[PDB]
Amino acid sequence: AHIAMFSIAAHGHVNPSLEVIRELVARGHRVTYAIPPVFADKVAATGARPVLYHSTLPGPDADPEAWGSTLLDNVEPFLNDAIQALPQLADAYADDIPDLVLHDITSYPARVLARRWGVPAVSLSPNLVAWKGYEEEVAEPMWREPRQTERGRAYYARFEAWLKENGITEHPDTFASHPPRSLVLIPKALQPHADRVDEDVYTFVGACQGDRAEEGGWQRPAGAEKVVLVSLGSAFTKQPAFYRECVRAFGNLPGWHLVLQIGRKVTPAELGELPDNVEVHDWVPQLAILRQADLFVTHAGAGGSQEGLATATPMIAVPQAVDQFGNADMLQGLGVARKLATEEATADLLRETALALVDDPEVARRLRRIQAEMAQEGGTRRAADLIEAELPA
Ligand SMILES: CC[C@H]1OC(=O)[C@H](C)[C@@H](O[C@H]2C[C@@](C)(OC)[C@@H](O)[C@H](C)O2)[C@H](C)[C@@H](O[C@@H]2O[C@H](C)C[C@H](N(C)C)[C@H]2O)[C@](C)(O)C[C@@H](C)C(=O)[C@H](C)[C@@H](O)[C@]1(C)O
Ligand SMILES: O=c1ccn([C@@H]2O[C@H](COP(=O)(O)OP(=O)(O)O)[C@@H](O)[C@H]2O)c(=O)[nH]1
Numbered sequence: 001a002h003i004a005m006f007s008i009a010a011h012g013h014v015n016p017s018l019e020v021i022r023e024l025v026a027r028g029h030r031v032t033y034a035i036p037p038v039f040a041d042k043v044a045a046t047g048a049r050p051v052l053y054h055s056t057l058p059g060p061d062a063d064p065e066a067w068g069s070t071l072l073d074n075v076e077p078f079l080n081d082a083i084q085a086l087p088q089l090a091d092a093y094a095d096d097i098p099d100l101v102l103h104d105i106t107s108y109p110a111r112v113l114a115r116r117w118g119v120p121a122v123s124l125s126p127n128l129v130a131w132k133g134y135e136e137e138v139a140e141p142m143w144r145e146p147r148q149t150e151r152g153r154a155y156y157a158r159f160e161a162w163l164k165e166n167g168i169t170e171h172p173d174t175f176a177s178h179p180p181r182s183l184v185l186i187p188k189a190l191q192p193h194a195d196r197v198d199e200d201v202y203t204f205v206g207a208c209q210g211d212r213a214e215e216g217g218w219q220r221p222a223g224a225e226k227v228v229l230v231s232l233g234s235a236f237t238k239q240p241a242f243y244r245e246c247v248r249a250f251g252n253l254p255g256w257h258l259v260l261q262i263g264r265k266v267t268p269a270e271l272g273e274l275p276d277n278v279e280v281h282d283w284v285p286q287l288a289i290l291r292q293a294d295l296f297v298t299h300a301g302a303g304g305s306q307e308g309l310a311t312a313t314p315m316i317a318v319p320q321a322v323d324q325f326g327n328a329d330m331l332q333g334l335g336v337a338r339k340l341a342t343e344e345a346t347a348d349l350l351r352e353t354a355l356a357l358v359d360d361p362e363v364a365r366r367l368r369r370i371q372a373e374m375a376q377e378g379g380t381r382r383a384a385d386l387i388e389a390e391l392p393a
Contacts, residue, residue, distance in 0.1 A: 001098075002097070002098040004051070004093065008081070009055055010057070013104040016185045017208065021047075024384050025046060033048040034052075034107075037052050037054075072146055082109050100392070102387065103122075108175075112166050121180070124383075125183070130178060139177065160172055183386055185206065185207065186206065187373070205378055205379065206306070215285055224257040227258075228250055228294065231284055231297075232320075233304055234263070243261075244271070245350070249350035250350075252277065258277060261282065265282065297316045301324065305327045309371070319342075334366060
């Protein structure tokens with residue numbers, strides 16, 4: 001019926017679920033989407049009707065450091081934003097109560113309002129979720145020393161008091177970290193402690209968009225036996241001492257063709273006369289390239305990691321920052337990748353690693369079983385089935 005999606009103005013919390021919104025609309029449901037004004041047009045592209053609230057969180061364009069760099073500086077803003085957001089949204093939906101509530105993990109008001117409405121809420125997570133064990137295993141030692149501070153005790157007391165005034169007796173950690181129903185938009189292959197996640201609460205549906213492969217008419221060179229892509233997303237990609245290191249590993253290496261990227265307009269020219277079997281770019285139809293590639297040197301960001309698995313492309317994971325270590329360790333543990341520190345990645349080690357991965361029927365054997373498992377996660381139309389299933393009679 002009336003499906004109301006909720007999120008914040010951050011690409012990583014809106015882009016993952018765009019196509020599922022689109023699908024429920026394409027079905028014939030009336031879908032509205034609570035969002036700050038900056039992303040009004042972004043969500044509107046999907047048929048969804050925007051519903052504009054004001055946010056106090058950093059803007060989508062704002063720097064990553066704007067979100068804080070301590071545990072309490074990371075979490076406090078989501079509560080403070082919720083407190084001022086909630087009464088805007090409660091107002092907005094009074095003259096049109098939605099039938100089902102959809103929401104990104106960051107929206108506390110969606111949780112509160114869904115309970116207020118007596119309607120199902122479905123949480124959409126663009127990253128890993130809690131497993132059975134998480135509170136004792138991970139949430140507790142994380143919170144022991146900060147919750148203990150006057151600052152931490154006060155944060156939790158405030159969170160509790162806000163919930164209680166809303167008729168919610170939930171402890172804030174269960175309210176925040178433990179949804180009653182969740183769809184997870186990463187492959188389960190990239191979820192730590194995968195068997196121990198609660199399937200009756202969480203269903204993994206993986207990426208939702210275009211595999212494969214979005215989208216630009218790339219062509220492997222006639223002659224190429226082994227194509228390698230180096231393509232570190234569109235963010236962590238301004239490294240002097242690395243691409244030139246990749247050129248040296250694969251440049252003039254018989255049989256291999258290197259698709260290399262950087263990101264200017266301009267400029268290929270910090271240096272390197274360059275071998276003939278190397279092509280450089282500012283940007284690529286990455287999914288499209290991986291669709292024929294035999295090897296992927298990746299920073300192991302969420303997208304790249306998903307895309308490598310989606311295309312059964314063995315990976316050299318060379319982690320660089322906050323998005324990466326665990327992802328690289330998991331790709332590692334799947335037996336489909338090698339983790340390298342930036343950084344010892346010598347030309348000889350990169351080459352040796354490359355060779356060691358592309359000629360392994362077993363590495364390929366693991367990647368094929370992963371794609372089969374991802375195909376069961378379905379994608380978009382699948383996420384809509386489950387959301388249609390929760391969308392009461
Ligand atoms: C498991 C279940 C928990 O998920 C997490 O632990 C994941 C694994 C964090 O990412 C991890 C991993 C990482 C890299 O974020 C991807 C890290 O930066 C943060 C601090 O923790 C998330 C998503 C963080 O979001 C990120 O916070 C950053 C400050 C800004 C970033 N974005 C808006 C720019 C945003 O996505 C952050 C703060 O926990 C979200 C707030 C709302 C929470 O406290 C919620 C309730 C979480 O505890 C949780 C959903 O229950
Ligand atoms: O030159 C590029 C770089 C990035 N991407 C796409 O941009 C996304 C990058 O996301 P990821 O999580 O991998 O890295 P991030 O940039 O967020 O750190 C992925 O879907 C890539 O396929 C692309 O198509 N061409």
